[PDB]
Design an enzyme around this catalytic site. Sequence first.
Site, mmCIF file in Angstrom:
data_model
loop_
_atom_site.group_PDB
_atom_site.id
_atom_site.type_symbol
_atom_site.label_atom_id
_atom_site.label_comp_id
_atom_site.label_asym_id
_atom_site.label_seq_id
_atom_site.Cartn_x
_atom_site.Cartn_y
_atom_site.Cartn_z
ATOM 1 C CB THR A 16 -0.936 0.018 1.215
ATOM 2 O OG1 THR A 16 -0.171 -0.054 2.420
ATOM 3 C CG2 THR A 16 -1.938 -1.100 1.162
ATOM 4 C CG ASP B 181 6.665 1.212 -0.682
ATOM 5 O OD1 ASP B 181 7.759 0.979 -0.135
ATOM 6 O OD2 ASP B 181 6.527 1.464 -1.899
ATOM 7 C CE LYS C 30 10.242 3.636 -1.486
ATOM 8 N NZ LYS C 30 10.883 4.098 -2.719
ATOM 9 C CG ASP D 258 11.990 13.012 10.127
ATOM 10 O OD1 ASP D 258 12.922 13.510 10.824
ATOM 11 O OD2 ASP D 258 11.062 13.691 9.618
HETATM 12 O O1 LIG Z 1 9.579 0.540 -1.780
HETATM 13 C C1 LIG Z 1 9.206 0.197 -2.955
HETATM 14 O O2 LIG Z 1 8.308 -0.623 -3.182
HETATM 15 C C2 LIG Z 1 9.823 0.928 -4.108
HETATM 16 C C3 LIG Z 1 11.211 1.084 -4.098
HETATM 17 C C4 LIG Z 1 11.872 1.337 -5.303
HETATM 18 O O3 LIG Z 1 13.127 1.295 -5.378
HETATM 19 N N1 LIG Z 1 11.170 1.416 -6.467
HETATM 20 C C5 LIG Z 1 9.842 1.354 -6.497
HETATM 21 O O4 LIG Z 1 9.245 1.443 -7.594
HETATM 22 N N2 LIG Z 1 9.107 1.197 -5.311
HETATM 23 C C6 LIG Z 1 7.624 1.275 -5.294
HETATM 24 O O5 LIG Z 1 7.134 0.127 -6.015
HETATM 25 C C7 LIG Z 1 6.063 0.527 -6.884
HETATM 26 C C8 LIG Z 1 6.501 0.384 -8.342
HETATM 27 O O6 LIG Z 1 5.326 0.445 -9.139
HETATM 28 P P1 LIG Z 1 5.380 0.207 -10.728
HETATM 29 O O7 LIG Z 1 6.533 0.993 -11.344
HETATM 30 O O8 LIG Z 1 4.022 0.704 -11.184
HETATM 31 O O9 LIG Z 1 5.509 -1.297 -10.944
HETATM 32 C C9 LIG Z 1 5.722 1.969 -6.524
HETATM 33 O O10 LIG Z 1 4.628 2.006 -5.606
HETATM 34 C C10 LIG Z 1 6.980 2.532 -5.900
HETATM 35 O O11 LIG Z 1 6.618 3.488 -4.915
HETATM 36 O O1 LIG Z 2 13.701 17.886 7.902
HETATM 37 C C1 LIG Z 2 13.933 18.245 9.108
HETATM 38 O O2 LIG Z 2 13.410 19.229 9.647
HETATM 39 C C2 LIG Z 2 14.797 17.344 9.936
HETATM 40 C C3 LIG Z 2 15.987 16.892 9.358
HETATM 41 C C4 LIG Z 2 17.016 16.445 10.191
HETATM 42 O O3 LIG Z 2 18.165 16.210 9.738
HETATM 43 N N1 LIG Z 2 16.860 16.464 11.544
HETATM 44 C C5 LIG Z 2 15.712 16.810 12.119
HETATM 45 O O4 LIG Z 2 15.620 16.801 13.367
HETATM 46 N N2 LIG Z 2 14.605 17.179 11.338
HETATM 47 C C6 LIG Z 2 13.271 17.425 11.941
HETATM 48 O O5 LIG Z 2 13.384 18.616 12.744
HETATM 49 C C7 LIG Z 2 12.711 18.416 13.997
HETATM 50 C C8 LIG Z 2 13.734 18.392 15.134
HETATM 51 O O6 LIG Z 2 13.012 18.549 16.348
HETATM 52 P P1 LIG Z 2 13.770 18.693 17.759
HETATM 53 O O7 LIG Z 2 14.874 17.648 17.878
HETATM 54 O O8 LIG Z 2 12.651 18.481 18.759
HETATM 55 O O9 LIG Z 2 14.299 20.121 17.830
HETATM 56 C C9 LIG Z 2 11.949 17.101 13.880
HETATM 57 O O10 LIG Z 2 10.593 17.346 13.501
HETATM 58 C C10 LIG Z 2 12.680 16.309 12.818
HETATM 59 O O11 LIG Z 2 11.745 15.502 12.119
#
Ligand SMILES: O=C(O)c1cc(=O)[nH]c(=O)n1[C@@H]1O[C@H](COP(=O)(O)O)[C@@H](O)[C@H]1O
Ligand SMILES: O=C(O)c1cc(=O)[nH]c(=O)n1[C@@H]1O[C@H](COP(=O)(O)O)[C@@H](O)[C@H]1O
EC number: 2.4.2.10
Lengths: 256, 256
Positions: free
Chosen positions: B59, B89, B91, B94
């Site tokens: 999903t 899925d 991913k 963070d």
């Molecule tokens: O995590 C995954 O499934 C993912 C990783 C990756 O390297 N490549 C990749 O295509 N996917 C996911 O697998 C599915 C590929 O779909 P199709 O290209 O339509 O077969 C999508 O939902 C992507 O988000």
């Molecule tokens: O994209 C970001 O903001 C992020 C990147 C990263 O390298 N480190 C990081 O802490 N963050 C985000 O920034 C916030 C950090 O929060 P505090 O650690 O509470 O100050 C969180 O919401 C994380 O998800």
Amino acid sequence: ELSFGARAELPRIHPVASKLLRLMQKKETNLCLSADVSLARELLQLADALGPSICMLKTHVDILNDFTLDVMKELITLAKCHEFLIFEDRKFADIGNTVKKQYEGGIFKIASWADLVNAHVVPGSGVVKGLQEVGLPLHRGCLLIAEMSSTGSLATGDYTRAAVRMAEEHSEFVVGFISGSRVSMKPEFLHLTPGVQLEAGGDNLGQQYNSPQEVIGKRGSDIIIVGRGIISAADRLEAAEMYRKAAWEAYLSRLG
Amino acid sequence: ELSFGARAELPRIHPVASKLLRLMQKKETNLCLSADVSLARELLQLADALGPSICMLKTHVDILNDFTLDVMKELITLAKCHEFLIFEDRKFADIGNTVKKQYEGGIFKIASWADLVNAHVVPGSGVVKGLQEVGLPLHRGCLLIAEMSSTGSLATGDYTRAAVRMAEEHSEFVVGFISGSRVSMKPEFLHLTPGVQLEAGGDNLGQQYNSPQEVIGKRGSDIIIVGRGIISAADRLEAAEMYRKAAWEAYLSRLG
Ligand SMILES: O=C(O)c1cc(=O)[nH]c(=O)n1[C@@H]1O[C@H](COP(=O)(O)O)[C@@H](O)[C@H]1O
Ligand SMILES: O=C(O)c1cc(=O)[nH]c(=O)n1[C@@H]1O[C@H](COP(=O)(O)O)[C@@H](O)[C@H]1O
């Protein structure tokens, strides 16, 4: 080195970056609040009270227990009132075809309300192309994650250089980076730095902190992203003001 | 090389991996449907019709326009009926403190219904620690993204080796990888490979395809993940059967 106000006028500046840089200089704030809360009422009360102190409010829409598009309508009203951008920290990190749907659609409709989003560069430039097919028509901007604050981060060396190249090759949509430091020499690009607290330390799950003076003053970043340093404080307004004054003075002292 | 049924009994096997490997051998399927649709009714009609043909339904809960936790209740009923796992899925990518809330909470409550989730390894091992603090108590498993199918992927060389080390050091929770190939020599670990179609080609946003014979037979992966190759076909049941038979025979011929 140019002031935020002068950077807002650079020939190649993105409109979203320009809007941000203008309000940073007008309000004397380079603080982004990381509004890491689960209740819409707390999100909106923080946005209203801290709005004057911040250039940006960063969301994780996916941890909000009572998300509705109406909550985000109320957030936009506060963003317009107090003049800050909304940044959804979604960290898009899939193939281009998938991220375009994750950005535009589903329950959250992120592109409808978020000025800025961000993306990891690990999948290749298709992540940016997919996002930009939604974001360009909706006049949005994107940040690329060039460095991360967490212990064991693999966003170093050639990885960081790849993020900078990808940003620079997609300047129509990419306006800057999540980084620990200045990574681009081009002043049109914003540097936003998370992992910030006034005191030394970390958390139990790999977060590492550096001070506003270190990341703005010594490492040359533009904006501090602060979550728990503000959110966990009793008086979140005075905490926000402490972080704002720290980041702003560090910026001024680097300008000379 | 052990059969899926024998791998299901390995001393260090994770319970979620064991359940999956057992139903793969029972049903003669190593096909994961990528159910990349925006309507709950289409998701559930595909899950019901293709359930017998698949070991897993993947999903993207965040592209479903009419998500509710009740839709996922109906999906679990079909998963139990037809015997397949649910893989969100998402991913995760963070810091640990953020991903634990994204996994457990918000509107989606992913951990409440997803057997499996996945994570990028770029933030360091804190991403896995944060997820495992929710997932271990809820008896869930996680896949680490060691290689990606998209053009310009930076998940190569030392990055892939780091993903394999991280998985192997967190075997209590990590049950395998998203990869293009066998990346771990330890048979307790599942390899799931997206970017699969019978015909050569790609999409306009960096997706690249290889065949089931190539990725299962030559590259030594366990499971094919197929989206558009099935979803865009007129007869999605016969398309699923073609992919199932391709992946299953490729697996059998590698066993000898
Ligand atoms: O995590 C995954 O499934 C993912 C990783 C990756 O390297 N490549 C990749 O295509 N996917 C996911 O697998 C599915 C590929 O779909 P199709 O290209 O339509 O077969 C999508 O939902 C992507 O988000
Ligand atoms: O994209 C970001 O903001 C992020 C990147 C990263 O390298 N480190 C990081 O802490 N963050 C985000 O920034 C916030 C950090 O929060 P505090 O650690 O509470 O100050 C969180 O919401 C994380 O998800």
